[PDB]
C-alpha cells in the first residue's frame, strides 16, 4: 500500500504534578517534547527536557519574562528583532520550599 | 607474585604517561599543521 508505519504509542508527555501539590525532591513535575513549561526556582531541567523538583515543597506555575542566554544564537536573534516595547513571556514551574533548611539542637552542655 | 607483577606494571606505565601523551599531542599537532600547510600551499597554487 502507499501509507505505512503511522503506528506508534503515545509518549505520555504531560504535566505530572499540578499547582498546589506537595512534592519531594526528585519528583518529575512535567515531561515534554518541546519546551512548553520552563523550569523556574528550585526546579531542575533534565536532558530530555523534563522538569523535576530539587527541593521538598509546593509546586507553583507562573508567567514570567524570558531573557535567553547570550550563548544561544537563535533566541538572541528572536529577542533582537522585537519592537522596542515588547517583552517575551513564558510559563515557569517553581517549588516553594517547605521544610526549614535545618535546625540547631543542643548537643552537650559542658 | 601476581599482585606485585600487576603493581609493577602499573607503576612502570604510569611513569611513562606524560611522555606518551605529550608525544602524541605533538604528533597530532604536527599532523594538523601538515594538513593545513598542504591546504594553504594548494590554495595559493590554485589562486596563482
Amino acid at each position: 500500500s502507499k501509507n505505512l508505519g503511522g503506528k506508534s504509542p503515545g509518549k505520555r508527555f504531560g504535566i505530572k504534578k499540578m499547582e498546589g501539590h506537595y512534592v519531594h525532591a526528585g519528583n518529575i513535575l512535567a515531561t515534554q517534547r518541546h519546551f512548553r513549561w520552563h523550569p523556574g526556582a528550585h526546579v531542575g531541567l533534565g536532558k530530555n527536557k523534563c522538569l523535576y523538583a530539587l527541593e521538598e515543597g509546593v509546586v507553583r506555575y507562573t508567567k514570567e519574562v524570558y531573557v535567553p542566554n547570550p550563548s544561544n544564537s537563535e533566541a538572541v536573534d528572536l529577542v533582537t528583532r522585537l519592537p522596542q516595547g515588547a517583552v517575551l513571556y513564558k510559563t515557569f514551574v517553581h517549588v516553594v520550599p517547605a521544610k526549614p533548611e535545618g535546625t540547631f539542637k543542643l548537643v552537650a552542655m559542658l | 607474585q601476581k599482585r606485585q607483577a600487576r603493581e609493577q606494571l602499573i607503576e612502570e606505565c604510569m611513569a611513562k604517561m606524560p611522555q606518551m601523551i605529550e608525544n602524541w599531542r605533538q604528533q597530532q599537532q604536527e599532523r594538523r599543521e601538515k594538513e593545513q600547510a598542504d591546504k594553504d600551499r594548494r590554495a595559493r597554487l590554485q589562486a596563482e
Binding site: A41, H42, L106 | -
Partner: protein, 143 residues
C-alpha cells in the same frame, strides 16, 4: 542548679544573614532555560548608562544591599568624566570598601561575553579583587 543554667534544646537563631554566612543556606538552583543563573546569595550587578556607571550588590530578593553609583555626590565631585574607564575602576574600589564594611566577602558576577572582554569591566573586577572581595561564592554544604 543555677537559674542561668536553663537552656532549652532547640536554639532559635533569628538572624537572616546567618545561614548564608555559614554556607549552609539554600541558594536557588533552577531556571537554566534563562539567564543569568539565579543561584547565589549575593550578586554583583553593573549597569552602564550612557552617562553614569552604577554598581549594585543584590540579594536574590532583588533587594539592593550595598551599592556605589556615579550619580552619588561623594564620588561625582572627586573625579572627572563619569562614563570613563577611570570611573569604573573608581566605583569598583568604593564598592569593595563598602562591601568589607558591610560584612560581605563573596558575590557572583555574571557578565555578558562581550562585557567580559571590555576594559572598564576587567578593571572593575581587578579593583574588586584587590579590594578583598572574592567573586565566585563558596559552594553550598550538603547542597
Amino acid at each position: 542548679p543555677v537559674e542561668n543554667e536553663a537552656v532549652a534544646p532547640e536554639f532559635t537563631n533569628r538572624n537572616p544573614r546567618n545561614l548564608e554566612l555559614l554556607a549552609v543556606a539554600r541558594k536557588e538552583r533552577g531556571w537554566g532555560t534563562v539567564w543569568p543563573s539565579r543561584e547565589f546569595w549575593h550578586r554583583l550587578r553593573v549597569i552602564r548608562t550612557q552617562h553614569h556607571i552604577e554598581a549594585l550588590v543584590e540579594h536574590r530578593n532583588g533587594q539592593v544591599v550595598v551599592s556605589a553609583s556615579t550619580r552619588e555626590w561623594a564620588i561625582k565631585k572627586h573625579l572627572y568624566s563619569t562614563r570613563n574607564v577611570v570611573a569604573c575602576e573608581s566605583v569598583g574600589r568604593v564598592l569593595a570598601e563598602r562591601c568589607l564594611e558591610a560584612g560581605i566577602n563573596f558575590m557572583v558576577y555574571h557578565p555578558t561575553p562581550w562585557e567580559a572582554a571590555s576594559d572598564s569591566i576587567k578593571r572593575l573586577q581587578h579593583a574588586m579583587t584587590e579590594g578583598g572581595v572574592v567573586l565566585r561564592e563558596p559552594r553550598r554544604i550538603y547542597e
